[PDB]
Design a protein around this ligand. Structure first.
Ligand SMILES: *[C@H]1CC(=O)[C@@H](O)[C@@H](O)C/C=C/c2cc(OC)cc(O)c2C(=O)O[C@@H](C)C1
Length: 340
């Protein structure tokens, strides 16, 4: 097999001339030449089969992406693995080769307002499709937003996605959570399992703020610090928003804090477009019930240049305890369509 950085990267003979390009959850990403389609592609190596949670994440992403088809979601072009379960130790996912991602771009590039607007439009266009399938991405952040050379944007990594379940969203205070800390909505720390669509809108609001200044807006250093950062900018929640938190431990934690005033968005972002800041405010609303929804965000005046509901498609239909052995079997079966 062809080898990359000491590790097998066994994708030939169709895919050759491999170069390291990035990191996925359970393996490296390489670029490669596709000898059939005569183009270079990206390939993610996945080695999940030792760990049950890894196999869960792998299977759920494959299941979702094999159903989804959208311009702003990076699809699965091919899946490579051994012909038998016994011989299958890794799985490789082949996807479009993008030029960069927004994490990399924000490290060194100032975005024009026109770029910010177009990026945000595309994020919300893809998110409209995801949410219309009753799916939550749950880990939106700059490194999951890939860009090609003409700044077309695609959302990556559905390994943390779930079907929305708003009736079962409530939990206790300081409940453990998996998705990336800086993009977590305040309710995650207070009373939410992250099972409603508003979780993703919060993350998009954080991404918009980060595009405006090239700095994460809420860079918390640990679990409860994340809430410190959010409240330091939004200010203390209103009585009405507190009354919506029935859990006593969460409510009383908030009541124990000194009063904090809101920091105006145009003080934080003095060069930003005023319409962008109005939309930012509605995405970074403390109360998730009051937070703007994706279709409302698309219709916001900041996005008027691009908004066109007839060109913002939706999904044709809505979308544990399983030992890794059944899950390896399920991954084998889910990937069978790409074999000869
Ligand atoms: C997308 C999700 C991820 O795994 C995430 O970690 C991503 O940031 C890693 C980047 C992968 C990558 C990098 C380049 O660099 C030029 C180009 C492409 O196309 C990709 C890519 O497609 O990532 C997919 C496989 C995972």
């Amino acid at each position: 097999p062809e080898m990359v950085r000491g590790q097998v990267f066994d994708v030939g003979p169709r895919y050759t001339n491999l170069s390291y390009i990035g990191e996925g959850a359970y393996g490296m990403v390489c670029s490669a030449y596709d000898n059939l389609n005569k183009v270079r592609v990206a390939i993610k190596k996945i080695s999940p089969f030792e760990h049950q949670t890894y196999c869960q994440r792998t299977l759920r992403e494959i299941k979702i992406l094999l159903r989804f088809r959208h311009e702003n979601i990076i699809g699965i072009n091919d899946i490579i693995r051994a012909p038998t379960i016994e011989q299958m130790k890794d799985v490789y996912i082949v996807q479009d080769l993008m030029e960069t991602d927004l994490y990399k771009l924000l490290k060194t590039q100032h975005l024009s307002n026109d770029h910010i607007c177009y990026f945000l439009y595309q994020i919300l266009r893809g998110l409209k499709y995801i949410h219309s399938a009753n799916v939550l991405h749950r880990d939106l952040k700059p490194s999951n937003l890939l860009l090609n050379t003409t700044c077309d944007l695609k959302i990556c990594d559905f390994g943390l996605a779930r079907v929305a379940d708003p009736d079962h969203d409530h939990t206790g205070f300081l409940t453990e959570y998996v998705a990336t800390r800086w993009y977590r909505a305040p309710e995650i720390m207070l009373n939410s399992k992250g099972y409603t669509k508003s979780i993703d809108i919060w993350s998009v609001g954080c991404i918009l703020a980060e595009m405006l200044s090239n700095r994460p807006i809420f860079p918390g250093k640990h679990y409860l610090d994340q809430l410190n950062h959010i409240l330091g900018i939004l200010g203390s929640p209103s009585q009405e928003d507190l009354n919506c938190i029935i859990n006593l431990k969460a409510r009383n934690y908030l009541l124990s804090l000194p009063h904090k005033n809101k920091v105006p968005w145009n003080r934080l972002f003095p060069n930003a477009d005023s319409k962008a800041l109005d939309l930012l405010d509605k995405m970074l609303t403390f109360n998730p019930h009051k937070r703007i929804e994706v279709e409302q965000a698309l219709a916001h005046p900041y996005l008027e240049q691009y908004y066109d509901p007839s060109d913002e498609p939706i999904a044709e239909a809505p979308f544990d305890d399983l030992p890794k052995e059944k899950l390896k079997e399920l991954i084998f079966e889910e990937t069978a369509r790409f074999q000869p």
